[PDB]
């Protein structure tokens, strides 16, 4: 076949809830999976682990790095310049890789449940809606009260560019199912989202049902002469 | 008149909502909402003494009164985070229409000691203002 | 309170078993409990308001509920609740040492990077 | 590599609205150049064509044929099985495909703008929301008033299944930015989901101002000589 070089970012969950920003490097397209060759520009802790050359496309062996590390240097932006100087070809080849620039941060949205799904009182749905982000990464979490509840009980959509209003930017979505009767009783709900362009790296919405739009509204003005104070 | 969500005091405005669980129709009620702002008749614009005249025009945003932007508190798996409440809280920088029982307003006049003169310091309310 | 600073500091122990009581743990005048031995002790830092207590070696029977107390004239009581959970210290030390008759001993100390900044 | 044969079932958007069912028995992997036959267990009176072969990953081609029966025999509960046939393996494939039972209604929801993207005078968002419907095939398109706006105008998520008790039901999700002065003036718009198990194939939402407005307002102007306020 064709030998190829890639190098990837570290993974968003655990940049943000952690800082164990592990790297990768891969090359793919090899049947000789022993003689190989990596190696980055910074090695201190130089123990770059490999590991079982697995197979790809009809059964090709592809080989791998790990290079550990934590998110100081990556967030500070350095580079990493991973090289392959293999003899399964007389020629290197080589890639590098960098925290992304010209960065934009989303904005949260959280929606109440239709009106005729209230109807029913059987289950009602919570849309949380984040838009507008220039990497394509994001986390997406719920919480109850102040308890978080488990990842098998939402399903979260991928990351997708929109229409082209001059620069490319992202979006997202999630939706979560709670029971009829205890959004009337008072609970509440929050969407958590964390991406890594925002400023303290994490926000948060939180909708309940008195928190929505009313049916009446009453409005009164008192004029006081007597003080400016405001007791 | 059960829960307050907006106890505003830069412009003496207070929101409060309640469910009211009304009687006919007994599988569906009402949400209500109160709003009460009292108006002051005699403040200035600026809180300083000879600014303009006394304000005429007195504008209320109730997307401004609801605003949260102070950090807050999340755990998350086994964790303490900080994160924020707010998508528009860009940067005090606010006009008040009222006072505050629990806060000073000071002035600087000068005035005359035969000689030179001095800043002579001046409390706009004098209940807030003892050193305590 | 800020103003009462001059004071000596409590630990308790809530039993609640028969009546309601409080054992003592630790003292701020230099007195500890006979079995809480090495894994105890009460800081006056951060100070200005607030002292510090720091339990470690924990077990599943540790969990209760536990006051903290002052000599004061009013006093505050506070109260907390320790919650023992699942997994593992992000400290890893080993066993405990010997020593040979007069040498040179080291031990380790491990930590992540989540306490780097630190 | 390892020859493989699998066929699909007919595009929705050429079953509803258009006239094409199109099955196609398609074996990619061969060994061989192109030599391949295929049969079909129905003789409706088409010729099943055939296309030229394709390119692949490092020397395997990709053969298909199209059967034109675009008739629709397929929803009156036929089974058309396929057969192949090539000098290869020599143990000639087969593939069966119908149409699924089980079939459940979409439930679907358009949810007006959050009230912060209106406070602001920029484009406001649109969310619609499907749920619960039994195979994973829709189809989602807008409009504004009559006029089918263009699909390079909105985006769409793919369709995934949600965490349920046992039945299995899926999801899926669109949004939708307009103009607030098109949304001020009191233009409509809407949403509109076909699917299979809808009688007549499709549903409509529309939304626009005045969707959550109050039914009572109060207003009360306290003069002067009566401020009897409490803290
Ligand atoms: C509302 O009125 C207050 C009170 O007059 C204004 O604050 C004051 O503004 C003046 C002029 O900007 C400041 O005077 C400055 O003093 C420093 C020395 O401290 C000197 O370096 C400057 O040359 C100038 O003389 C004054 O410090 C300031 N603050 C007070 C009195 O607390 C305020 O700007 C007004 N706000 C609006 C929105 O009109
Ligand atoms: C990173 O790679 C790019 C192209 O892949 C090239 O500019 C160079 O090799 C590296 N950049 C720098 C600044 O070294
Ligand atoms: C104690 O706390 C007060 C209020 O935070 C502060 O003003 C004071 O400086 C503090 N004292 C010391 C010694 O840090
Ligand atoms: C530590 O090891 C010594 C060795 O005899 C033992 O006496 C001591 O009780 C041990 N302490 C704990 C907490 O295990
Ligand atoms: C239909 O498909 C099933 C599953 O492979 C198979 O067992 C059966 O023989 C097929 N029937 C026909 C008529 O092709």
């Given at each position: 076949?064709?030998?190829?070089?890639?190098?990837?970012?570290?993974?968003?969950?655990?940049?943000?809830?952690?800082?164990?920003?592990?790297?990768?490097?891969?090359?793919?397209?090899?049947?000789?999976?022993?003689?190989?060759?990596?190696?980055?520009?910074?090695?201190?802790?130089?123990?770059?682990?490999?590991?079982?050359?697995?197979?790809?496309?009809?059964?090709?062996?592809?080989?791998?790095?790990?290079?550990?590390?934590?998110?100081?240097?990556?967030?500070?932006?350095?580079?990493?310049?991973?090289?392959?100087?293999?003899?399964?070809?007389?020629?290197?080849?080589?890639?590098?890789?960098?925290?992304?620039?010209?960065?934009?941060?989303?904005?949260?949205?959280?929606?109440?449940?239709?009106?005729?799904?209230?109807?029913?009182?059987?289950?009602?749905?919570?849309?949380?809606?984040?838009?507008?982000?220039?990497p394509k990464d994001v986390l997406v979490?719920?919480?109850?009260?102040?308890?978080?509840?488990?990842?098998?009980?939402?399903?979260?959509?991928?990351?997708?560019?929109?229409?082209?209003?001059?620069?490319?930017?992202?979006?997202?979505?999630?939706?979560?199912?709670?029971a009829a009767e205890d959004w009337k009783?008072?609970?509440?709900?929050?969407?958590?989202?964390?991406?890594?362009?925002?400023?303290?790296?994490?926000?948060?919405?939180?909708?309940?049902?008195?928190?929505?739009?009313?049916?009446?509204?009453?409005?009164?003005?008192?004029?006081?002469?007597?003080?400016?104070?405001?007791? | 008149?059960?829960?307050?969500?907006?106890?505003?005091?830069?412009?003496?405005?207070?929101?409060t909502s309640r469910i009211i669980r009304?009687?006919?129709?007994?599988?569906?009620?009402?949400?209500?909402?109160?709003?009460?702002?009292?108006?002051?008749?005699?403040?200035?614009?600026?809180?300083?003494?000879?600014?303009?005249?006394?304000?005429?025009?007195?504008?209320?945003?109730?997307?401004?009164?609801?605003?949260?932007?102070?950090?807050?508190?999340?755990?998350?798996?086994?964790?303490?985070?900080?994160?924020?409440?707010?998508?528009?809280?860009?940067?005090?920088?606010?006009?008040?229409?009222?006072?505050?029982?629990?806060?000073?307003?000071?002035?600087?006049?000068?005035?005359?000691?035969?000689?030179?003169?001095?800043?002579?310091?001046?409390?706009?309310?004098?209940?807030?203002?003892?050193?305590? | 309170?800020?103003?009462?600073?001059?004071?000596?500091?409590?630990?308790?122990?809530?039993?609640?078993?028969?009546?309601?009581?409080?054992?003592?743990?630790?003292?701020?005048?230099?007195?500890?409990?006979?079995?809480?031995?090495?894994?105890?002790?009460?800081?006056?830092?951060?100070?200005?308001?607030?002292?510090?207590?720091?339990?470690?070696?924990?077990?599943?029977?540790?969990?209760?509920?536990?006051?903290?107390?002052?000599?004061?004239?009013?006093?505050?009581?506070?109260?907390?609740?320790?919650?023992?959970?699942?997994?593992?210290?992000?400290?890893?030390?080993?066993?405990?040492?010997?020593?040979?008759?007069?040498?040179?001993?080291?031990?380790?100390?491990?930590?992540?990077?989540?306490?780097?900044?630190?």
């Amino acid at each position: 076949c064709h030998p190829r070089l890639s190098l990837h970012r570290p993974a968003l969950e655990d940049l943000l809830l952690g800082s164990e920003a592990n790297l990768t490097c891969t090359l793919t397209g090899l049947r000789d999976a022993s003689g190989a060759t990596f190696t980055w520009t910074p090695s201190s802790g130089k123990s770059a682990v490999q590991g079982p050359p697995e197979r790809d496309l009809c059964g090709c062996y592809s080989v791998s790095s790990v290079l550990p590390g934590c998110a100081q240097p990556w967030n500070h932006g350095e580079t990493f310049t991973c090289t392959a100087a293999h003899p399964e070809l007389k020629t290197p080849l080589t890639a590098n890789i960098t925290k992304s620039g010209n960065t934009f941060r989303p904005e949260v949205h959280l929606l109440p449940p239709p009106s005729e799904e209230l109807a029913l009182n059987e289950l009602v749905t919570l849309t949380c809606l984040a838009r507008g982000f220039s990497p394509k990464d994001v986390l997406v979490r719920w919480l109850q009260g102040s308890q978080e509840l488990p990842r098998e009980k939402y399903l979260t959509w991928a990351s997708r560019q929109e229409p082209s209003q001059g620069t490319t930017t992202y979006a997202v979505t999630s939706i979560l199912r709670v029971a009829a009767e205890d959004w009337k009783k008072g609970e509440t709900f929050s969407c958590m989202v964390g991406h890594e362009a925002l400023p303290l790296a994490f926000t948060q919405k939180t909708i309940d049902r008195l928190a929505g739009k009313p049916t009446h509204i009453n409005v009164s003005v008192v004029m006081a002469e007597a003080d400016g104070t405001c007791y | 008149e059960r829960i307050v969500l907006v106890d505003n005091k830069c412009k003496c405005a207070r929101i409060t909502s309640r469910i009211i669980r009304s009687s006919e129709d007994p599988n569906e009620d009402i949400v209500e909402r109160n709003i009460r702002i009292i108006v002051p008749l005699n403040n200035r614009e600026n809180i300083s003494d000879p600014t303009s005249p006394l304000r005429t025009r007195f504008v209320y945003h109730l997307s401004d009164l609801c605003k949260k932007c102070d950090p807050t508190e999340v755990e998350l798996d086994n964790q303490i985070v900080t994160a924020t409440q707010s998508n528009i809280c860009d940067e005090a920088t606010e006009t008040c229409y009222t006072y505050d029982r629990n806060k000073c307003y000071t002035a600087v006049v000068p005035l005359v000691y035969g000689g030179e003169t001095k800043m002579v310091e001046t409390a706009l309310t004098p209940d807030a203002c003892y050193p305590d | 309170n800020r103003k009462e600073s001059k004071s000596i500091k409590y630990w308790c122990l809530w039993e609640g078993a028969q009546n309601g009581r409080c054992p003592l743990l630790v003292d701020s005048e230099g007195w500890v409990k006979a079995q809480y031995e090495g894994r105890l002790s009460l800081l006056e830092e951060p100070g200005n308001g607030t002292f510090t207590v720091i339990l470690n070696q924990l077990t599943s029977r540790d969990a209760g509920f536990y006051w903290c107390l002052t000599n004061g004239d009013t006093l505050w009581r506070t109260t907390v609740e320790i919650k023992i959970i699942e997994g593992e210290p992000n400290l890893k030390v080993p066993g405990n040492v010997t020593a040979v008759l007069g040498e040179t001993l080291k031990v380790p100390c491990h930590f992540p990077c989540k306490f780097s900044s630190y």
